[PDB]
Design a protein around this nucleic acid. Structure first.
Lengths: 178, 166, 232, 100
RNA sequence: UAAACGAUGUCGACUUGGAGGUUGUGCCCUUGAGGCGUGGCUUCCGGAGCUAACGCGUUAAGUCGACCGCCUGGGGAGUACGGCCGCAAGGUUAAAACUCAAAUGAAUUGACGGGGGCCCGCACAAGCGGUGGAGCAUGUGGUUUAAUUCGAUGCAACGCGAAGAACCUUACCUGGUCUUGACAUCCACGGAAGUUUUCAGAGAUGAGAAUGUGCCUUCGGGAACCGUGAGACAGGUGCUGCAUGGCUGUCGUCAGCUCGUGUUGUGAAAUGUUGGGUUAAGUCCCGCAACGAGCGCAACCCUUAUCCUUUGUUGCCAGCGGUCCGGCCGGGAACUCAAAGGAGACUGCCAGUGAUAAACUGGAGGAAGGUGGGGAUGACGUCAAGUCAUCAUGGCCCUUACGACCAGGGCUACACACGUGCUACAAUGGCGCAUACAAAGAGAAGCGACCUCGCGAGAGCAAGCGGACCUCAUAAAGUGCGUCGUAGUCCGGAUUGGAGUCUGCAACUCGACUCCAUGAAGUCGGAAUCGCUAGUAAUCGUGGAUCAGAAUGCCACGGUGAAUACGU
């Protein structure tokens, strides 16, 4: 489906910030719709990281948000023959949002005395490659990096393509010929 | 938008009526199809199948198609000068020379088709498919096997047809 | 047979209606029932002639009827007694002092309901209904209008089973929401049971009805551009 | 639908006027707070036995022009079905379709 | 035996060719299974002619020839029966009673492939939240009684007809009570209706008191309300939705459908209305029998956004006065501000993408860019789809009633399951204290400042009101600080005791709101499953429709306001 490609919209800034990495961090921290609390939840977390080390307030945040963060994803496709998979490369925008989502689900159940302590400790824990979504990033990227050896209904697609102009190689495809 | 042929006389022989269905794709619409025969009094190859929303608009469409891409054709006296067996598409019909003392002898819509054709005294049995849509080709194929009079002596009869172009 | 709601969800958004009055609050109900009654009883009294639109109107201190006909002065009677009687009953039902004026609509000699009268007769007498709807549309398009839709239903031709049939011609848009366009639903019985025609007729897409007002009401006709406004 | 509830309502407005008019706040005057040390006694607590049908609390109305089983609308004197029906034919004034 | 065949008997003569496979042989640069010359079988392609269609066409299914084989509706039967051959099962030509109106060659379009391939909706995805689990709200069924009334059954039933349900309502059930009858006209009798007021009975209804005897007139007599009675006649959630009318839901925003007409085929019918690329689009580049035009879609349309523009109150206030510094008022017009003319933005530009191209995406100034934001907005029409119960209505039944007055009971029971939605399970939150800003709208039997009463809701009285004037209204979440650790808590607060309130003689089961004390279910719920692209989704309060009395919903508003849209 879809008659056209449609991109992201403009997202507005918040009354305490003009930086984007802050405004996008408060946004997917938003629950009950109320960002004006989440403003504080981000800035109270960042001060606690900053007491743990004073070189930066960003110490544990920047590498947690790299380390629990994927690069590739796998879809499953088959309309005949045998079961196959097709890996895709995805956008930074969704790599980032899986990672931040997983940080805020894991930290809110972490059960410490302030949401500020809970997030600084869960970024401190994933920064060192031993937190709760290191496993989730590692399994998901393994499966997408591995299924690059398969393609939608390969056995008829290999004859079908070379008859209707195409290659004699072995390649992944978006639910068509290969 | 085309040339048409006319007769100085009216023919409105409606032979068949039908309805068009697609049954799910837009469901079923009220449209009809129709077949109507336009002679001349001595004959035409005039046969028209057309279609529209309602029966009147449908027949008038079909009556129009019975007089475009068609021409009139002609035969002297109420008989045919050849005993020939006209066939058109499994509907096969017969003729043999006759008197004026007999006129039509036929039923249904066929007696009305033969009267304009000039082959009503010679009217002999039809065989194969004799339902309305194809039975009515008397005045088409039965006037393409045609013979018609032009001689004064039977022994000049083949000589007279040769000199008609030589 | 989905039958999209053919005119109700299309009004008041530069599309005039068959009433123009103001009411609000809890008494809107007492004014509407009274307006139905005067619509029902008044057109029955002037039924001597055929009639093309009906407009009943309630401005400050008065009740004003506009009526539209295929010929003018015809429901107004002779002398002036006939029309004082029309004003007697308009006051009696609404309960306010009464006015009526006579006026005609765009394309007056044609109207939605006079097509359905023409189609009904053949059916009432149980003969000649197979070309009748088509001849009605032909006459109708010879007397005016830029497009017409006719839909007939009934135990049609006097049949012992029901039939839907319709006939459409020219330019009759169906998502249209600008200019008044004329509609009638007939209902009637004869020996075999009920018949009916739904008659949509389409005059114009900016021809007929009101137009959108081309100014504010705020600068115009104001001989003194202040009360004070701080400027004195 | 169904005339018997419409028949009940038509009788009721003359019966509102007859029983209930003289006995509106009489409940309150003779029994409740208006009976502040006056009344509250048996020799006056027999006076209101006629009104029971006449009461505004049984004055449900429904559709004022045909009758309808529930779903009445007080501003038109009409109902869901009958409003839409009158609007198709343009009989209702001031009537927009919502767009803003 | 058989699908045991140039599917086409045998063999032959004649009828525009070209070329493929592959081969005698003349000729070639032997220039690639080739060409030309002249034969070959064997196959593609198509003309004269032929077919019902596929198809045939110089190897005929053409034009024919001689001479032989064979058929006479189907099923039952290539069997039986007869003659004959066969170790032996068998083979061989080839039939009827009986059954039956068909059986059978071909092809159109829908549907459909699990044959090949193409496309779309927030339908998924990319996520986010919700129902289903708790409890409550409310509808459905199950199950129950005098009866717990139906209509409807994924998408096309279940916050929907049937939006405010004590009786009324209202179908249901039972009890009183009458038949022109709640209601119209027409005749007959008793009471005027209206109002105040005691009482009997359940209330219907009636008696008595006190006020009034109006209305028109032959004061015959009747209308008005109520009782009484008779016809004509009124009335009928009366049946039948294959007897119907009006009306509407579906596919679907499918991306197509239809109206007039020509053409190709013997025609059914197609074509257009189908392909590629592009789209909200029959929009637009390319193009075949489609041509012209309409529908869906685009448009006018109301609305927003800045911004121009005018009014200047029941709206506003930069400076200025009265002054507690409040537009309340002297006064002012810079200003929002309300409702309206509208301006601006056109996929128009530039660049990428795209088949040149529509158009999509990016780019930029700007309040704002994806046909600016929002809404309007949905074709012909099969579906025997659903309503005779708004309403219309025949055939056709009751009319001491399938009407009608009056009271009481019930849908809302409770066993649970099921649709939908509400608010919780947390801490993005709750609590405590302190602290903030709305939009919109409803109020002429009404609500309503002050008033006195009130734990609060509210109460009766009333200035006032017409709602930008007055009041609902302390708007809440949110904000400030401190606090809380998965422990049913610092979340949730159902039940229940018990008090206070509303419309009304009358709140017990069936109704709604306030408030005091205690206190359970519920740790984000399985199968199942949907809505959503941005003022949306989520979440908190508000008002309104409805509305005798009252909301958890709906409907619309405003607070605080998100992830992403690769891909089919």
């Amino acid at each position: 489906p879809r008659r056209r490609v449609i991109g992201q919209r403009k997202i507005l800034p918040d009354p305490k910030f003009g930086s984007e990495l802050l405004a996008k961090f408060v946004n997917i921290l938003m629950v009950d719709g109320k960002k004006s609390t989440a403003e504080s939840i981000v800035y109270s977390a960042l001060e606690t990281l900053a007491q743990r080390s004073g070189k930066s307030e960003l110490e544990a945040f920047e590498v947690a948000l790299e380390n629990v963060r994927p690069t590739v994803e796998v879809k499953s496709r088959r309309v005949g023959g045998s079961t196959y998979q097709v890996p895709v490369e995805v956008r930074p925008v969704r790599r980032n949002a899986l990672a931040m989502r997983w940080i805020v689900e894991a930290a809110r159940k972490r059960g410490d005395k302030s949401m500020a302590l809970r997030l600084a400790n869960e970024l401190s824990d994933a920064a060192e490659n031993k937190g709760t979504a290191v496993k989730k990033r590692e399994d998901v990227h393994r499966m997408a990096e591995a299924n690059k050896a398969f393609a939608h209904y390969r056995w008829l697609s290999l004859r079908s393509f070379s008859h209707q102009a195409g290659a004699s190689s072995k390649q992944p495809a978006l639910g068509y010929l290969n | 938008a085309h040339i048409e042929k006319q007769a100085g006389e009216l023919q409105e022989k409606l032979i068949a009526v039908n309805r068009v269905s697609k049954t799910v794709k837009g469901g079923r619409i009220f449209s009809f199809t129709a077949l109507t025969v336009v002679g001349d009094g001595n004959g035409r190859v005039g046969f028209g199948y057309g279609k529209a929303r309602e029966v009147p608009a449908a027949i008038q469409k079909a009556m129009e198609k019975a007089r475009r891409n068609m021409i009139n054709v002609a035969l002297n006296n109420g008989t045919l000068q050849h005993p020939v067996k006209g066939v058109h598409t499994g509907s096969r019909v017969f003729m043999q020379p006759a008197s004026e003392g007999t006129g039509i002898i036929a039923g249904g819509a066929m007696r009305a088709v033969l009267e304009v054709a000039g082959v009503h005294n010679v009217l002999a049995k039809a065989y194969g498919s004799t339902n309305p849509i194809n039975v009515v080709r008397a005045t088409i194929d039965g006037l393409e096997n045609m013979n018609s009079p032009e001689m004064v002596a039977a022994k000049r009869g083949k000589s007279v047809e040769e000199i008609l172009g030589k | 047979g989905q039958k999209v709601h053919p005119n109700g969800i299309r009004l008041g958004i530069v599309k005039p209606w068959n009433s123009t009055w103001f009411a609000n609050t809890k008494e809107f109900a007492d004014n509407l029932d009274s307006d139905f009654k005067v619509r029902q009883y008044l057109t029955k009294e002037l039924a001597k002639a055929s009639v093309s639109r009906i407009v009943i109107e309630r401005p400050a201190k008065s009740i004003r009827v506009t009526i539209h006909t295929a010929r003018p002065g015809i429901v107004i009677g002779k002398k002036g007694e006939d029309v004082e009687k029309l004003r007697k009953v308009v006051a009696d039902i609404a309960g306010v002092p009464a006015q009526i004026n006579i006026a005609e609509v765009r394309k007056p000699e044609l109207d939605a309901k006079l097509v359905a009268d023409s189609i009904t007769s053949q059916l009432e007498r149980r003969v000649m209904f197979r070309r009748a709807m088509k001849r009605a549309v032909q006459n109708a398009m010879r007397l005016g209008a830029k497009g017409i839709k006719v839909e007939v239903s009934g135990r049609l031709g006097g049949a012992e089973i029901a039939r839907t049939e319709w006939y459409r011609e020219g330019r009759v848009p169906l998502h249209t929401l600008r200019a008044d366009i004329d509609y009638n639903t007939s209902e009637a019985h004869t020996t075999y049971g009920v018949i009916g025609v739904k008659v949509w007729i389409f005059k114009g897409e900016i021809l007929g009805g009101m137009a959108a007002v081309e100014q504010p009401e705020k600068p115009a006709a104001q001989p003194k551009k202040q009360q004070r406004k701080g400027r004195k | 639908a169904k005339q018997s509830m419409k028949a009940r309502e038509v009788k009721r407005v003359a019966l509102a006027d007859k029983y209930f008019a003289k006995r509106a706040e009489l409940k309150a005057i003779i029994s409740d707070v208006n009976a502040s040390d006056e009344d509250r006694w048996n020799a006056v607590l027999k006076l209101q036995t006629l009104p029971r049908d006449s009461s505004p609390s049984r004055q449900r109305n429904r559709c004022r022009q045909t009758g309808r089983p529930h779903g009445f609308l007080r501003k038109f004197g009409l109902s869901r079905i009958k409003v839409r029906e009158a609007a198709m034919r343009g009989e209702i004034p001031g009537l927009k379709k919502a767009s803003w």
